[PDB]
Amino acid sequence: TTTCVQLQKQVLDLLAQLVQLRVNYCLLDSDQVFIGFVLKQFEYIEVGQFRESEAIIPNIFFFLVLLSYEIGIPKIIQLCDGIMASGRKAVTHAIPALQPIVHDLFVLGKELETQKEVVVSMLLRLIQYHQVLEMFILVLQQCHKENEDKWKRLSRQIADIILPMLAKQQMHIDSHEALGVLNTLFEILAPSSLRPVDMLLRSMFVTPNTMASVSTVQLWISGILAILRVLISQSTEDIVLSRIQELSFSPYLISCTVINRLRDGKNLPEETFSRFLLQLVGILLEDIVTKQLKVEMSEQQHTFYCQELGTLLMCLIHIFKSGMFRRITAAATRLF
Amino acid sequence: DRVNHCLTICENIVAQSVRNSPEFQKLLGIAMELFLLCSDDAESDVRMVADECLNKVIKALMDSNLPRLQLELYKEIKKNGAPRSLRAALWRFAELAHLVRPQKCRPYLVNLLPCLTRTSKRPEESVQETLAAAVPKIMASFGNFANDNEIKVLLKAFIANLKSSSPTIRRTAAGSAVSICQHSRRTQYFYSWLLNVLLGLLVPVEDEHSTLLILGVLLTLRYLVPLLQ
């Protein structure tokens, strides 16, 4: 009978406890009025005619899966697909629906494998948000515990999905938590998926559409940082520089006139990598200094932009101090 | 005797402990009509006693019998009669607009749009000044349920009161139109539609514009600037 939503939330948590503690389902002795009313609430949410659906939906799906362990799992996946394929934005409705499904299907014969493939394809449809990347970190760990060949194939498949999204700035990496989740995703991902340095460098040396907007610069430099931490960590120095020797990566990719026209509108691999790094430093410092504080950028964008410059200077320090990168240090001593 | 009559009607409604009964629903409907007749008579005693009495009756019964109440409550909106009766009525019912369920919200919207067009044209200043805190609550509770043309008609109805000479009716029409566009369905489209309409009202400025209309348009824009952000 109510309309306040936190009461509904506490009633669903109390029923989740009553089904966890193994009592019978005698709260509805004859009929099934409660669960049909819950399905009608799903209809009213998927239409859009609900007021505070943001704070109710993960408890509904957690109660549904915890009831279905005794409703099929395909009906729960079809309800989540009905919310996803037709409804509002996905950070409140689709992804808090996907959290109790994935956490209570992978952690805890053939039908399970088919539902795993369907849920994984659903997550592949929603890669663009970093909470799906946390959920997929759980996927990769629970696949790495079971068998390594499925782990390597699934890591390869999401790797050559995720690297063109980093190339075209279609990944939402505006927060610091997004970079944290993205870096832990590339750490937990399998090494043979990232072992050719073709795609990691064809998605590295890219130019944004127009860097006049702050968010385009911020996504581009977050992609560069989140792939450059992988190029420092996972791969050595001679492999990366030889792979830049083979591919036509000119150091005049982002030159000064290229940056100016985007804001208005024989080479060693040492040279290309060093000028790319120092000129990315130039972009970040010239944008932090000569941009307004509330006119052009926000306050959170200012902290994350300063924080990108902090992490890139840390990556330069680790390149210059670790002793593994020798040629790049000689290049910077002959380029500063 | 009338004061004690309305009070014994209260104490005989509440002390039944018999809910969801047809006899109790008929008695509650007849007695609710009697309460909004108790709130009409002209004295400071009977009005305030029936006012606190009716608030006791409503707040004592929000749990069990909600839709029978708001059925009778909208029935005594639709009559559209006395100022004080409709005023206290529309107070209570804008306050209780959020207790509805999203199953039954669409008929209450379909039936509340003509009554808002009716009470948006009443020249009484107190009815307007108490309609100031009703269109925000109703259009926050029911606003996401209408379609485009109904909200366009109801916005033009509230725009057609920006021409008046009283300050209260202009500020209630302003706050009403803006709070319609706060919770509507597609907020940016209706913000652009009110910008088109309000800039059409003051197209080329080297004209006569009936300065009360200029005051009303500037007050609408003072309420509409904080949400374009």
Side-chain angles (χ1 to χ4, degrees), chain A residues 1-285 288-336, chain B:
Chain A
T1 61
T2 188
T3 314
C4 63
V5 185
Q6 286 83 18
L7 187 273
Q8 292 173 349
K9 176 167 74 70
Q10 293 306 116
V11 169
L12 288 169
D13 285 334
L14 186 271
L15 290 174
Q17 185 179 3
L18 284 176
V19 179
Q20 280 182 357
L21 299 168
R22 280 89 169 93
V23 310
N24 198 1
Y25 193 73
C26 65
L27 303 173
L28 293 178
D29 53 357
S30 68
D31 292 331
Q32 53 183 356
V33 181
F34 179 80
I35 196 67
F37 181 71
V38 172
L39 299 178
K40 290 180 182 179
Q41 285 186 354
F42 275 106
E43 292 180 356
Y44 291 154
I45 290 167
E46 289 182 353
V47 172
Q49 296 177 358
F50 200 84
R51 190 175 65 245
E52 291 289 328
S53 178
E54 188 270 331
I56 191 174
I57 197 68
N59 289 307
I60 306 171
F61 278 96
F62 177 71
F63 173 68
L64 288 177
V65 61
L66 194 273
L67 180 62
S68 70
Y69 280 164
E70 288 185 353
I71 294 172
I73 304 169
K75 287 179 94 289
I76 303 168
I77 299 169
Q78 285 183 356
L79 286 177
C80 184
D81 197 1
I83 294 174
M84 190 179 299
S86 177
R88 298 292 300 274
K89 65 182 177 67
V91 296
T92 61
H93 295 87
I95 299 167
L98 287 171
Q99 291 181 355
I101 297 171
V102 177
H103 181 73
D104 291 333
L105 200 147
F106 294 165
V107 177
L108 280 77
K110 299 297 293 296
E111 292 86 3
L112 287 174
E113 295 174 355
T114 59
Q115 292 170 0
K116 286 184 179 179
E117 290 183 352
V118 171
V119 169
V120 163
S121 69
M122 189 178 290
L123 294 176
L124 291 171
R125 190 176 67 189
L126 286 178
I127 290 173
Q128 293 177 355
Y129 295 101
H130 60 277
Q131 300 182 0
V132 176
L133 291 177
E134 295 184 357
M135 203 182 298
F136 195 79
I137 286 167
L138 292 176
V139 177
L140 282 173
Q141 292 179 356
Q142 294 304 112
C143 290
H144 180 73
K145 190 177 292 295
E146 186 175 2
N147 50 3
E148 291 182 353
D149 52 355
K150 184 178 179 181
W151 179 59
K152 289 181 182 179
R153 188 261 182 191
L154 181 140
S155 68
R156 182 175 177 180
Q157 195 259 332
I158 203 160
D160 62 355
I161 293 173
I162 197 170
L163 291 171
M165 287 183 180
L166 292 172
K168 294 179 175 66
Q169 292 88 21
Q170 296 176 356
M171 192 67 70
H172 299 287
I173 321 165
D174 188 75
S175 295
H176 185 73
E177 294 179 353
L179 279 179
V181 172
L182 205 154
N183 290 322
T184 56
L185 189 273
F186 274 111
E187 290 179 356
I188 296 167
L189 193 145
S192 68
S193 299
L194 300 169
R195 185 65 59 83
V197 199
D198 292 330
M199 196 66 206
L200 292 173
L201 290 173
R202 289 177 181 175
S203 178
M204 173 62 75
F205 291 156
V206 293
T207 302
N209 292 317
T210 59
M211 63 175 68
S213 178
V214 179
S215 178
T216 304
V217 188
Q218 202 164 2
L219 293 176
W220 176 56
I221 293 174
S222 70
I224 291 174
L225 266 293
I227 301 169
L228 191 142
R229 188 176 179 274
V230 177
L231 294 178
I232 287 173
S233 176
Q234 297 292 322
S235 294
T236 64
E237 182 260 338
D238 197 3
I239 296 171
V240 170
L241 292 183
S242 177
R243 186 72 264 172
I244 298 170
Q245 282 180 357
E246 186 67 30
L247 299 175
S248 294
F249 284 150
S250 69
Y252 292 91
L253 182 61
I254 37 102
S255 67
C256 182
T257 180
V258 172
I259 296 164
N260 290 320
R261 71 104 183 271
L262 293 180
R263 289 178 178 176
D264 290 332
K266 293 181 181 180
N267 289 318
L268 296 175
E270 302 175 357
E271 180 72 26
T272 66
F273 195 71
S274 177
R275 296 305 299 166
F276 184 75
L277 289 177
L278 301 180
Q279 198 160 7
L280 203 283
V281 173
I283 294 171
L284 281 170
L285 289 179
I288 290 171
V289 173
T290 63
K291 277 186 178 176
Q292 288 75 239
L293 198 148
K294 295 288 184 180
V295 180
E296 183 69 27
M297 62 178 71
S298 296
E299 183 66 29
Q300 192 270 331
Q301 291 179 356
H302 186 274
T303 65
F304 184 71
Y305 208 69
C306 182
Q307 192 167 1
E308 285 179 349
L309 192 273
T311 61
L312 198 276
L313 295 189
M314 286 296 179
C315 291
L316 288 176
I317 289 170
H318 180 77
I319 285 171
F320 290 166
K321 279 179 69 175
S322 179
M324 188 64 204
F325 301 96
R326 298 286 182 181
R327 294 181 182 177
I328 301 169
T329 55
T333 56
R334 71 184 71 188
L335 280 170
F336 276 103
Chain B
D1 291 331
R2 187 181 296 115
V3 170
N4 293 319
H5 179 73
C6 309
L7 195 146
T8 53
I9 284 172
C10 179
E11 292 179 354
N12 290 320
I13 287 171
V14 180
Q16 296 296 321
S17 178
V18 178
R19 280 89 170 94
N20 210 166
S21 178
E23 181 68 29
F24 180 71
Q25 286 179 355
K26 184 178 179 180
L27 192 276
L28 190 146
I30 296 168
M32 179 63 214
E33 293 181 353
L34 289 175
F35 285 123
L36 284 181
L37 288 175
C38 292
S39 66
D40 200 4
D41 290 331
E43 198 179 5
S44 67
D45 289 330
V46 181
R47 290 178 294 167
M48 294 299 289
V49 168
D51 186 73
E52 297 180 354
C53 181
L54 190 273
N55 290 122
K56 288 183 180 179
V57 174
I58 291 298
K59 189 178 288 293
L61 292 173
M62 293 188 291
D63 193 3
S64 179
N65 295 115
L66 199 277
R68 178 66 181 172
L69 284 176
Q70 289 181 358
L71 186 145
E72 294 293 328
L73 300 181
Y74 174 67
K75 280 185 177 178
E76 280 178 343
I77 284 179
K78 191 188 286 293
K79 291 181 181 179
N80 196 1
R84 295 176 181 176
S85 176
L86 186 145
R87 181 176 179 269
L90 180 270
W91 282 354
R92 268 73 164 174
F93 312 156
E95 290 292 328
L96 295 177
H98 74 277
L99 264 295
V100 302
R101 295 170 65 187
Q103 184 178 3
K104 294 180 181 179
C105 57
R106 176 68 177 175
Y108 284 110
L109 179 137
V110 172
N111 291 117
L112 258 291
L113 291 173
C115 292
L116 283 173
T117 61
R118 289 176 182 175
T119 62
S120 63
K121 294 182 181 180
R122 178 171 286 169
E124 183 69 28
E125 293 180 354
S126 180
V127 177
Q128 297 292 321
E129 194 268 333
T130 64
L131 191 144
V135 181
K137 290 181 174 65
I138 294 171
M139 295 304 290
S141 65
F142 293 110
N144 291 315
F145 300 138
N147 215 166
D148 194 2
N149 289 318
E150 289 86 3
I151 298 168
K152 286 183 179 179
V153 169
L154 199 271
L155 281 172
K156 289 179 183 178
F158 278 103
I159 284 169
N161 291 321
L162 273 300
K163 297 177 176 65
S164 296
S165 66
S166 177
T168 60
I169 185 168
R170 289 178 294 172
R171 71 183 67 186
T172 56
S176 176
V178 172
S179 182
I180 288 155
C181 292
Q182 294 187 359
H183 307 91
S184 176
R185 182 67 179 271
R186 298 180 296 170
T187 62
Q188 297 297 109
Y189 177 72
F190 286 102
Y191 289 158
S192 178
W193 189 71
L194 283 188
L195 285 176
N196 287 319
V197 173
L198 290 172
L199 291 175
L201 290 175
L202 297 177
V203 74
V205 301
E206 296 294 327
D207 283 323
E208 294 179 353
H209 290 285
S210 179
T211 68
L212 303 172
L213 184 143
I214 298 168
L215 294 173
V217 169
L218 294 180
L219 209 153
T220 58
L221 292 177
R222 288 197 295 116
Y223 288 163
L224 191 144
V225 168
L227 285 94
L228 295 178
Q229 183 178 2

